[PDB]
Design a protein around this ligand. Structure first.
Ligand SMILES: N=C(NCCCSC[C@H]1O[C@@H](n2cnc3c(NCCCc4ccccc4)ncnc32)[C@H](O)[C@@H]1O)NCC1CCCCC1
Ligand SMILES: [K+]
Ligand SMILES: [K+]
Ligand SMILES: [K+]
Length: 543
DNA sequence: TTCAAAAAGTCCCA
DNA sequence: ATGGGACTTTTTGA
């Protein structure tokens, strides 16, 4: 959880580089989750140089006895550096580190061992920097979540993250005219959960700059995707955001001595976004992509949500109790009426699904424990303890052997389209085989009233096109290197069109499906057909 | 009653 | 041992 030095230096310089120490020699710089002091120790160094280089100007303008080089260390610690953290061992270490910068009478260091989200803050701050804790909805303590939902409701609801609240706290205790700079996960820029947080930021601070590392691995051995947000409360009217979006996610961050060298390089693209034009969604793309995205949005008269019914897959609550290999001998104990075909996200390709290798025991259809005791005793019951610990079993809503969220079978046992929940690219397939799946695969079918306007074959044709792959990724939620979330909260917002190319687009899609399903697959002709279809779609959308 | 979101992902190997 | 690639469960609030 140590922040790389190149990033820490950038964040501290972002807040302090243009501070007028002559005009205000008492800046308050705060790290609200300071830890061992990665940021605060750097703040000390930047401040010490700033005072030392202007010591004679300060001595002349103010108390000439107070402003001496020998007094800089005491002045910084008494008036300038502030830190908070729940870990007292970390605070104890940081207090010694700040004390040892000088090496008389004891100096008072403004370090607080507390919950920053609970501390009564007695004053606001000129500059706030740091790296807050990230805790999601599963890993956050439930008693603590009751407090967040009560006191941080403006940014924390439902599946929100703890670091949303730190954004609220930082914004709230930032002084008028102050600057804040933090590194957090990037997901709030796009996630459904971040909607209220994005609204809070946009309407309370001026966002100066967003550094989006997309799927690059900033923290070694940490599966998180990062961004750096810099914002102020200055009296400003232009309110444009500098956006630095990484171009190559494989870049090593230490290739340059400073992060500014990386941002100005070819490894990053830069563009500006007008904060006044931000909706509840933040479309952070360059001018070419915005033009591309807007062309499609205006041209398409329908969305998938308009024409389709979407649903999440089965959630058994314990897969090992209900999912068996189709060659497992224990399936001889299970009547075939209980057995469903089961696929994973890797089984979804463009246009068609791999033949399934697993079976789901649709245990909800087992009427009672004595009629099918063999299945319960020998297959499902091997995990009875874990099954009984599921929420709906402890409450009695669900029997110990039942699927936790078995949905409705009739939704799955029909022609439908399926796609993986996380993928590098658009993979929408037509399911012909009544496949069931877990929540790693999403499904939709077409509403009856739109069947004469849209066919499954036409839909997988355009949804798998290069145009729609780029189109979806403009606003999709970037998760990790080469992985986007394909979830209904964005997939169902995809807009679709219907025009004179409909018949030829549909016909090419049928050819691709026919080739994909034959014995000797010549994958090459599929690629040529896809190129022809992409041209038709670009012709249709005028790009 | 029952939906769908959530990576400080998880796990393995060369 | 690490960094990078393949692949993705069920807990949870609403
Ligand atoms: N995913 C993670 N990553 C690691 C955090 C790294 S973040 C950097 C600094 O941040 C410091 N830090 C963290 N939280 C706060 C905070 N509010 C309390 C948050 C709510 C809470 C409730 C109950 C238990 C724990 C936490 N206020 C001030 N400092 C804080 C924290 O000590 C750390 O050195 N989990 C770890 C989780 C386990 C218990 C201790 C740390 C939290
Ligand atoms: K003087
Ligand atoms: K990453
Ligand atoms: K992990």
């Amino acid at each position: 959880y140590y922040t790389p030095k190149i990033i820490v230096d950038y964040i501290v310089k972002k807040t302090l580089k243009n501070h007028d120490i002559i005009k205000n020699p008492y800046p308050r710089i705060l790290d609200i989750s300071c830890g061992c002091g990665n940021f605060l120790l750097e703040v000390y160094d930047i401040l010490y140089d700033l005072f030392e280089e202007n010591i004679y100007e300060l001595k002349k303008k103010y108390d000439e006895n107070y402003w001496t080089v020998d007094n800089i260390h005491r002045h910084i610690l008494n008036y300038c550096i502030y830190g908070a953290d729940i870990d007292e061992k970390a605070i104890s270490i940081l207090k010694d580190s700040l004390t040892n910068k000088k090496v008389e009478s004891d100096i008072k260091i403004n370090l607080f061992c507390c919950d920053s989200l609970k501390k009564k803050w007695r004053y606001k701050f000129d500059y706030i920097v740091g790296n807050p804790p990230y805790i999601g909805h599963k890993k956050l303590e439930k008693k603590y979540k009751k407090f967040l939902l009560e006191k941080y409701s403006e940014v924390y609801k439902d599946k929100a993250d703890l670091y949303f609240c730190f954004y609220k706290k930082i914004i709230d205790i930032l002084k008028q005219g102050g600057i804040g700079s933090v590194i957090t996960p990037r997901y709030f820029l796009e996630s459904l959960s971040g909607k209220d947080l994005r609204e809070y930021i946009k309407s309370n601070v001026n966002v100066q700059e967003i550094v989006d590392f997309l799927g690059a691995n900033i923290f070694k051995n940490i599966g998180v995707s990062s961004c750096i947000l810099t914002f102020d409360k200055k009296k400003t009217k232009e309110t444009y955001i500098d956006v630095f979006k990484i171009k190559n996610e494989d870049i090593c961050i230490n290739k340059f001595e400073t992060l500014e060298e990386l941002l100005k390089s070819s490894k990053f693209e830069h563009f500006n976004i007008n904060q006044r034009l931000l909706s509840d969604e933040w479309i952070l793309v360059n001018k070419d992509d915005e033009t591309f995205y807007n062309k499609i949005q205006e041209k398409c008269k329908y969305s998938l949500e308009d024409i389709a019914i979407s649903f999440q897959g089965i959630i058994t609550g314990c897969d090992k109790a209900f999912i068996l290999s189709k060659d497992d001998v224990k399936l001889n104990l299970v009547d075939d009426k209980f057995l469903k075909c089961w696929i994973k996200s890797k089984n979804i390709n463009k246009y068609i699904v791999d033949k399934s290798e697993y079976r789901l025991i649709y245990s909800n259809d087992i009427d009672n424990e004595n009629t099918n005791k063999r299945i319960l005793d020998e297959i499902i019951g091997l995990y009875k303890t874990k099954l009984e610990n599921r929420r709906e079993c402890k409450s009695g809503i669900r029997k110990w052997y039942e699927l936790q969220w078995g949905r409705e079978k009739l939704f799955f046992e029909r022609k439908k389209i399926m796609y993986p929940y996380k993928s590098n690219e658009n993979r929408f397939a037509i399911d012909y085989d009544n496949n069931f799946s877990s929540a790693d695969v999403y499904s939709f079918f077409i509403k009856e009233e739109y069947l004469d306007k849209f066919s499954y074959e036409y839909l997988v044709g355009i949804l798998n096109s290069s145009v729609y792959d780029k189109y979806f990724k403009i606003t999709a939620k970037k998760m990790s290197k080469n992985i986007y979330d394909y979830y209904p909260n964005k997939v169902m917002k995809i807009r679709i069109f219907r025009d004179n190319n409909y018949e030829e687009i549909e016909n090419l899609s049928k050819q691709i499906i026919s080739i994909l399903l034959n014995k000797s697959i010549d994958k090459g002709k599929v690629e040529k057909l896809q190129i022809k279809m992409d041209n038709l779609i670009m012709d249709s959308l005028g790009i």
